[PDB]
Amino acid sequence: MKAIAVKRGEDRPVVIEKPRPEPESGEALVRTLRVGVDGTDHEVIAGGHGGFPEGEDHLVLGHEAVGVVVDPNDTELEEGDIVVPTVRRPPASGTNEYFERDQPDMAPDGMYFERGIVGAHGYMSEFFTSPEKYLVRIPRSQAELGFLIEPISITEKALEHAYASRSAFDWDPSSAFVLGNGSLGLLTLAMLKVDDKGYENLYCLGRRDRPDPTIDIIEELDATYVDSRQTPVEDVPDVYEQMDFIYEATGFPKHAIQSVQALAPNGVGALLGVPSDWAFEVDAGAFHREMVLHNKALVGSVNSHVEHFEAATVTFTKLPKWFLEDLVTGVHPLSEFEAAFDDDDTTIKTAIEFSTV
């Protein structure tokens, strides 16, 4: 079968040929339909974040997949089920408490693999296998955009933990601010629009000049676009308002610290970005004091698990159809796969189509 991989010490993604996998007991064989590309694939291509599987000359890319079950083997899935795989798998050494208690999304560094990211091959191949417990059935009509279920689930987890931090009191937020206008930030902005907490005012931070299709999406969602070149995060409360909820999806360390100054009293910031080490001068006193005197919280979140994937299928149904059309800027057949990795300002979310139906 054909797969898209990065080979050791090489620049670009290439097609390689590999044997079709055979499922072991408890695994289904899945025929890949579409696989999404995000920053991590780019990040993994260049070098930073992730790592190749031991003893292998390459890494099959892709962690956002949808496929059709072609051989259910000895599992309780049915031939033709549309499934989305979770990303985390047990490490080489074997199972651990995080997997045994069904919360692999909470496993620390070195106690998990992430398919297509660290230690294990991804899903950009014509077929793959997985244990039934890590394959989530989704409605058949979500198959075409099913690679979006994984990123939606990332936000479903982050919101769950962020909201739990505010559960000891009566919190009624009215404003939310998403930092970043990438595919995660934009998806999140749309989710916040339909969130049960009933946000009235939405804001999204970016740094683009008009005309720009990400600005258009933000404003078409009835949110306010904030240019960070004109209004840094710290200054937002003066120009606009204090924000009850902040969701950080920029990967810019200054935002993690500065968001505390933009939070309303009793607010919470969710941090999703993954930056490199970067040292600079901060007023730690102001950070510390705001957190305490105004009962604020910061919560970090990574990955997601089955329950968040399931929740994502419901959220998906609530998202406007125009939004999904504008977010996915290209789906490319395997024959033209290189186009899926071209990044420019007009490219938002791409995917590669391996097969149909």
Ligand X SMILES: NC(=O)c1ccc[n+]([C@@H]2O[C@H](COP(=O)([O-])OP(=O)(O)OC[C@H]3O[C@@H](n4cnc5c(N)ncnc54)[C@H](OP(=O)(O)O)[C@@H]3O)[C@@H](O)[C@H]2O)c1
Chain contacts with its own copies (rule: CB under 8 A): 101, 103, 105-109, 160-161, 164-170, 253-254, 256-257, 265-266, 271-302
Answer with the entry of its own copies, Zn ion, ligand X, none that 45 interacts with (C-beta below 5 to 8 A by kind).
none
* SS3 of residue 321 by DSSP: helix
* CB neighbour list of residue 54: distance below 8 Å, 6 or more residues apart: 92, 119
Minimum CB distance to ligand X, residue 155 (Å): 9
Question: Of 173 and 180, which has the nearer Cβ to ligand X?
Answer: 180
Q: In the window 12-41, what residues touch ligand X (CB under 6 A)? A: 38-39
332 is in an annotated binding site: no
Q: Which one-letter amino acid corresponds to residue 207?
A: R
209 burial level (CB within 10 Å; 0-12, 13-18, 19+) = exposed
Question: Of 76 and 280, which has the nearer Cβ to ligand X?
Answer: 280
Round to whole Å and give the CA distance between 255 and 240. 17
| 258 is an interface residue for ligand X by CB under 6 A | no
What is the size of the binding site for Zn ion (CB under 5 A)? 4
Minimum CB distance to ligand X, residue 142 (Å): 20
Round to whole Å and give the CA distance between 158 and 178. 13
302 is in an annotated binding site: yes
Question: Of 257 and 331, which has the nearer Cβ to its own copies?
Answer: 257
Of the CA atoms within 13 Å of residue 20, those in its CB half-sphere come to 12
Per the CB < 8 A criterion, the answer to whether 266 and 296 are in contact is: yes
| 105 is an interface residue for ligand X by CB under 6 A | no
Round to whole Å and give the CA distance between 312 and 332. 24
Site string for ligand X, 261-300 (x = CB under 6 A): -----------xxx-----------------x--------
336 is in an annotated binding site: no
How many whole angstroms from its chain centre is CA 6?
Answer: 21
| 116 is an interface residue for ligand X by CB under 6 A | no
Q: Rule CB under 5 A: which residues touch Zn ion?
A: 38, 64, 150-151
